[PDB]
Amino acid sequence: LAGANTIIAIMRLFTPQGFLRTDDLAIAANFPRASRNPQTYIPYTNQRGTVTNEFASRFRTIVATLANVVNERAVQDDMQKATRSCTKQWLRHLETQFD
Amino acid sequence: MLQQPTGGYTTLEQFAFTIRNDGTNATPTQFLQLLSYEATENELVKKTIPTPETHLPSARNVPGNVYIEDAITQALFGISAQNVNAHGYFSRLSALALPNTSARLGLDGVIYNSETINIPFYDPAAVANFAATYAKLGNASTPRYRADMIDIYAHVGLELAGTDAERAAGVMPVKRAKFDSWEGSLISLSRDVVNWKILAFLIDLCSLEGEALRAFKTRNRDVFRMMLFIMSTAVAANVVNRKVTKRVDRVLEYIGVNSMRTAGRTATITYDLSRHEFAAKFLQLTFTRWNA
Amino acid sequence: IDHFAAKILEDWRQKEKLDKGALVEADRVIQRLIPLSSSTYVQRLAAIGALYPNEFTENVLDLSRLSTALLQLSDTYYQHANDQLRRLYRRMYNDSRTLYMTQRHQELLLAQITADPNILLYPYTYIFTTIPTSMNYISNTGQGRIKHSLT
Amino acid sequence: NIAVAHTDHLSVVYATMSNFMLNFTNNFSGNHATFKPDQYVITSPEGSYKPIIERQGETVDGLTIIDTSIVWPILCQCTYPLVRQSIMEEIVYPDPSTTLSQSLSVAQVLSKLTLPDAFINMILSGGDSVVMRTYQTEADDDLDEGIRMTTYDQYLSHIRERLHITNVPDPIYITGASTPDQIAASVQATHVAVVLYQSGVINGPASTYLRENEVLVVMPDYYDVVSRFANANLQMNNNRYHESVLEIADIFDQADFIQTSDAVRQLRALMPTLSTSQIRHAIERIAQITDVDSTDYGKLTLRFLGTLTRSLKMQNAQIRRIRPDGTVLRYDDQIDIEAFRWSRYFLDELQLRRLSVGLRLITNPRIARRFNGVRIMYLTDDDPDPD
Amino acid sequence: KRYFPENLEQNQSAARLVSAVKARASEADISSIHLAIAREVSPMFNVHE
Ligand SMILES: Nc1ncnc2c1ncn2[C@@H]1O[C@H](COP(=O)(O)OP(=O)(O)OP(=O)(O)O)[C@@H](O)[C@H]1O
Ligand SMILES: [Mg+2]
């Protein structure tokens, strides 16, 4: 959109990280299936590299974005000013749990 | 006593200077051929090098036979040397400066207080010419006599990277050296250079005169350039590698620019501040002899 | 930053007078400061400072917030339409420790070193030939609307 | 009456306490108007960073709250040896050793305390990797050959921050007007061989440059990618490509940033696929094996600290200042201390020098005695030779 | 549970944040978790809310 870029940006955080999979085995077995081309989304895939994980790293860019969002959140009260920075530390925690 | 040929001591096969490369004992010239230089926007112009001080530092009363070549080569190319000006045994070279001194400089690179048996040594006249200049390394730390450690590196660049036209001009673009590389190539290079018997080079450099000198200066240009190269890597701001289709090019930025860096790094030898002052002095003297 | 800026204004005014050929009682030939260690921004000020940009003489910059304009000026020169001025500014930015100066300044430094043989002056110094620019901007800070007569 | 005791006595105490070993930060500039502490963080490309200074709400047993009211006893109910003139206390000049030793002990603990983590993270330093497609631009190209490409997301998530650490200009965008020499200059300036696609069809000489030089184009997305290139050869095709991992060590090469020696490469080759959990388990094991020596003051400080280290990532972790605005700055050659430019995997110099020799032992054929593969065959063993 | 870093829960400035998290974070129960993973693949007939 012309001027709602931050909103579209944040909405992109919701985009699925998986892949659409045709139901090959169910088709071979001639299992009942209402769709002319059966398939289901798989929320995430196998980690391909030896160490890096695409899923975790995606959640990492997500919390980076969210920390930029929280950091730009103007507040008036001092306590709100605190909870902002605490919220940022907590995100930095969540990223490690997720990884 | 080793006789000095009509050429230098460097003409003798005993004093060959050769870095290891591709599994063989390569001459410095055939290493420097591997080098290639990307130009950058910056320019080096060479200022006149100040005349080295008249002073020869006192050779303090030292009973021992100082290992001088080891001290110098480790101060210039040594991987681990530091506080090189704390001991100050470089001054000892001025024991050799005097006419008819008892002291001898052995081929071993040791300054014996008196001639001793079964230790070959350089011709005393040659060493005297050599000491009359290089004893001044002994005052590399004293505040009055310190060399500039920034501008001098311009000469280094010109003497290394500089094309003959850039050398005639006295001004070249700051360059960025690169070469096909094996792991630990600069460490290994510097250690091949620490083992060089450079007092042979410096002694021929100070003793030879006339055409016999000039014939030396062409013959050993690449050697001097290898010493300059190791110092350059020692002072280079950064030393990266590049993947280049299953090959690697080591790349140092930048030739001729002393970054004054002192924090150690795996890629190359590092100068402590003392090694910087020393190397600056060494370059002052050596470039002074090289351009006369 | 504020210090370097005030000095750049002093050096530019002085050079602006020197280039008019007037005799000057300058207390020092290059009035501007040399960073020995500074951040990016001071290096930018050092660079446009040494350039002696035409834009100062035209009063194109506003001195009400001097350093700001100076920073902005560097931003143009960093990506300047002119190749020579761009590469010159870049080169000055990458060697901030060097003191860039015009040949005409340099001869004054020589006269100074001649009159006082043991005078100290900053040793790291490049001598660039200045790049001419033909664009004579009109300008006038200070109150008064312009009453154009359009052709 | 007390000003004499502060200025002429407390001041020398402050002046010596300033030189103590562990008092490492600058404390104050004397300008309330402008002072802010320098704000270092331990950033990693593949993790979230830790500020050193943080308002983390640990109170260190109440050390962080400040009772300003403390000035009242100072001005009004305390004696000082100088204040007391006329009796004469005679000033105390405490032995250095008692603090010095303490400092050493601490410095000696926290020195080796990180070693096992540092060693493993050195090994796996080149091991992070980006998925990349390799489209083939001509007939009879093996699937490894061809133009290489990665999504902008992968570049932003791995390659970019590592460029910021490596301290190089951001790689040039290619616009299809881009001459091969410009791409050449780009890779020369930022030593990693990477350029970002921006817009427009890319000319064929440039395509030959990107193919011959293994340059990694960073496509915004994989949508009709062949339209982006001038496929005059008509061999390159949207269905014709090969997905594969590309290790960070296979693009970066920097001696103190990312271990890239062939020995450690072989070690990574022998490794099972890993996870932060497995890596942490390895580190906990190496710690379990080397039970470090500790002076009694070191055991004391260790229990004071005194537990978890597990949270922070160390994949290519560096010390780098943040801006107060929150952005992580590049290493400034004229500000940040030189030691911060490359954490040397947080290993000591001698440890590196030895480490190289160890790589020489590891890569040696004689110790390479795990054998792979076998041959079932039904021969008689007439003349038994193992070889 | 692992919702907060040490020692953010103890911290008095974090109180509003911590109460926020605690108001969201449900106790784990195998049946409910399994139901979520299974709902992902099971057909829906009555529309979810
Ligand atoms: N005026 C300038 N002079 C020299 N280099 C510059 C200049 N502006 C930017 N750079 C280079 O770009 C980097 C800064 O990027 P960028 O310009 O996006 O942000 P900035 O520092 O705020 O500058 P600007 O205000 O021009 O945006 C610096 O590392 C510097 O090398
Ligand atoms: Mg003044």
SS3 letters across chain D: CCHHHHHHHHHHHHHHHCCCCCCCCCCCCCCCCCCCCCCEEEECCCCCCEECCCCCCCCCCCCCCCCHHHHHHHHHCCCCCCCCCCCCCCCCCCCCHHHHHHHHHHHHHHHHCCHHHHHHHHHHHHCCEEEEEEECCCCCCCCCCCEEEEEHHHHHHHHHHHHHHHCCCCCCEECCCCCHHHHHHHHHHCCCCEEEECCCCECHHHHHHHHHCCCEEEECCCCCHHHHECCCCCCCCCCCEEEEEEEHHHCCCECCCECCCHHHHHHHHHCCCCCHHHHHHHHHHHHHHCCCCCCHHHHHHHHHHCCCCCCCCCCCCEEEEECCCCCECCCCCCCCCHHHCCCCCCCCHHHHHHHHHHHHHHCCHHHCCCCCCCCCCCCCCCCCCCC
DSSP-derived secondary structure for B107-159: TTSEEESS--TT--BB-HHHHHHHHHHHGGGGGSSSGGGPPPSSTTHHHHHHH
Q: Which ligand is nearest to the CA of C26?
A: 2
Of residues B134, B128, B126, B98, the one with CA closest to residue B5: B126
Which residue in E2, E13, E40 is closest to A86 by CB distance?
Answer: E13
> What 8-state DSSP symbol labels residue C65?
G
Looking at residue D120, its amino acid is I
Q: Is B140 left (phi over 0), alpha (psi -120 to 50) or beta?
A: alpha
Task: List the residue whose alpha carbon is closest to atom 30 of ligand 1.
Answer: C40
Which residue in B79, B251, B266 is closest to D191 by CB distance?
Answer: B251
For ligand 1, whether the C-beta of C89 sits within 6 Å is: no
Å between C37 CA and nearest CA of chain D: 5
Q: How many helices (H) and strands (E) does chain A have?
A: 4, 2
Measured CA to CA, the distance from residue B244 to residue B239 in angstroms comes to: 16
Q: What is the resolution of this structure in A?
A: 3.0
Measured CA to CA, the distance from residue B197 to residue B93 in angstroms comes to: 16
Å between E4 CA and nearest CA of chain A: 7
Measured CA to CA, the distance from residue B91 to residue B59 in angstroms comes to: 5
Chains that touch A (3 or more CB pairs under 8 A): D, E
Q: Which ligand is nearest to the CA of C91?
A: 1
Looking at residue D244, its amino acid is S
Measured CA to CA, the distance from residue C92 to residue C43 in angstroms comes to: 9
Looking at residue A64, its amino acid is A
> What 8-state DSSP symbol labels residue B195?
T
For ligand 1, whether the C-beta of C44 sits within 6 Å is: yes
Q: Which residues pair with D196 in a beta bridge?
A: D173, D218
Within 13 Å of residue A78, how many CA atoms lie on the same side as its CB? 2
Measured CA to CA, the distance from residue B26 to residue B107 in angstroms comes to: 23
C19 labelled binding-site residue:
no
Are D345 and D126 in contact by the 8 Å Cβ rule? The answer is no
> In a 3-state reduction of DSSP, which class is residue B188?
helix
Measured CA to CA, the distance from residue A51 to residue D275 in angstroms comes to: 6
> In a 3-state reduction of DSSP, which class is residue B25?
strand
What tokens does D333 get? 């050659």
Measured CA to CA, the distance from residue A82 to residue A99 in angstroms comes to: 26
Are B252 and B238 in contact by the 8 Å Cβ rule? The answer is yes
Kindly tell me the sign of the dihedral angle through the C-alpha atoms of D300, D301, D302, D308: positive
Do E and B touch (≥3 CB pairs < 8 Å)? no
Helices B198-207 and B221-235 pack at an angle, to 10 degrees, of: 120
What tokens does C112 get? 């100074």
Measured CA to CA, the distance from residue B68 to residue B135 in angstroms comes to: 11
According to DSSP, the β-strands at D318-321 and D241-247 are unpaired
B205 alpha-carbon distance from chain centroid: 12
CB atoms within 10 A of CB D237: 13
Measured CA to CA, the distance from residue A90 to residue D70 in angstroms comes to: 35
Chains A and E form CB pairs within 8 A to the count of 31
Measured CA to CA, the distance from residue B73 to residue B134 in angstroms comes to: 13
Are B9 and B2 in contact by the 8 Å Cβ rule? The answer is yes
Of residues B79, B93, B104, B116, the one with CA closest to residue B266: B79
E16/A89 touch (CB, cutoff 8 Å), yes or no = no
Ligand 1: atom nearest CA of C74 is 1
For ligand 1, whether the C-beta of C52 sits within 6 Å is: no
Residues 6 or more apart from B3 whose CB is under 8 A from it? B123
> In a 3-state reduction of DSSP, which class is residue C73?
helix
Tell me the domain boundaries of chain B: 1-292
For ligand 1, whether the C-beta of C93 sits within 6 Å is: yes
> In angstroms, what is the span from residue C38 Cα to ligand 1's centroid?
15
Measured CA to CA, the distance from residue D316 to residue D319 in angstroms comes to: 10
According to DSSP, the β-strands at D241-247 and D50-51 are unpaired
